[PDB]
Amino acid sequence: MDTAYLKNCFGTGLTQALAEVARVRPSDPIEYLAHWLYHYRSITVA
Amino acid sequence: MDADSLLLSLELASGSGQGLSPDRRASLLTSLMLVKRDYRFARVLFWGRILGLVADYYIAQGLSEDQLAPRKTLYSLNCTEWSLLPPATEEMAMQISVVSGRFMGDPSHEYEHQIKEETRLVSIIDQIDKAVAIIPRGALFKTPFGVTHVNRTFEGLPLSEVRKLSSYFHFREADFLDSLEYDIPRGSWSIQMERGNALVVLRSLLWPGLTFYHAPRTKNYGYIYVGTGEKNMDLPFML
């Protein structure tokens, strides 16, 4: 399967993403996920 | 300096002796409140004066959330009539290098070396802010959101830390800010104690007319440039 590639690539990020989205329950979860992933880079890479 | 420097004569309390009359002080209080209204600045500090040969440019600076932002300058000849001065760039810094002499009151004045006096005002105010705009150590706290805010829990410097140039910061892009101990010449800053040594006065020698106010007992501080508006290139000779 393609699990191992995406095992390495994402890992903790999607977990924190949907954990925050499920906790918040926004009106648009998908846009919230995209903005959160942007912010997640803006903390991690920088 | 903030509005607290305009309810009392904090400028003349520094002993530099140049400042605003109570006429100009009350007018400036009302006008900077109206500037904070018309221009949605977080704070509106009185930058100072550029003493001209016909009239003096009363200068105000807009402060954003986000205080290290490219601060927005305003000017006024009759104090109250505030007008948004344009921002500064590198070309306009290089443009005025061929010109020397005292400022003229009319900002439409032209030099043949043409060059507008407004461009001189913009560039000289930018140069003064990049060089000698003072922040005491710990007054500004770099927020985790990529933004600088007032360190609103800032207690004034201990009297041991008063005498060090390391306890004072350049109020510009870069504890995040650059300290004054690298501001060459090494003797370029004069530190003196007035008013029972409840007052630290820190004056620029490279840009005469700057006098930075600080009360060590509290968080009352600020800088004002009331002066001629030229750079003392003679500073290493004078030290």
């Binding site: 590639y5 690539c9 949907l18 989205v21 648009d28 846009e31 996920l33 | -």
Partner: protein, 201 residues
Amino acid sequence: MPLPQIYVEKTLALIKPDVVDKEEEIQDIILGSGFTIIQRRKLHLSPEHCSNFYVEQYGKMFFPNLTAYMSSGPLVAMILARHKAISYWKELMGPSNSLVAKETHPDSLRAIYGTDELRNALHGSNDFAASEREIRFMFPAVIIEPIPIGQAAKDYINLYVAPTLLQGLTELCKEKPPDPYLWLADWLMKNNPNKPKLCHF
């Protein structure tokens, strides 16, 4: 609720543009009564916002005056919270129709500040679930409810998030792009099923 944990009850509370001028007295009575204010905010609901805020009841409350009285100037919304928050706030308010509250409840805030049926001085949560719905509408990104620890989070994700996230990650697996997060996030923004496609040209 009978956990080790202990619980805060929360309620929405609004002031209309014909009563916002008396925001300060209303907040004084709110604080003095024992409420605690979590967050303030100044609103200005366009008619689209008004249609969405009453969406649980906008399909029956066909009152253009009711949309105007939210749109004709700013609002002052608050989260209030104290012991039995919704019932105490109801007790201060009284009947929803101010024309009844004026004569029958002298102590009511709606009698003191309100005018009539549609010019009601205050609007707030009439139900705990309604409290979560209106508070999640008006003040986004404020946690108000118990966290869905168990299967409820999985159901939420499977009903809203997974039908898009699965397919987007599947295409991300076909492409194997570099720095995969751009591909995923831009894909989610572009092909959101709950939003239209935007062509910035």
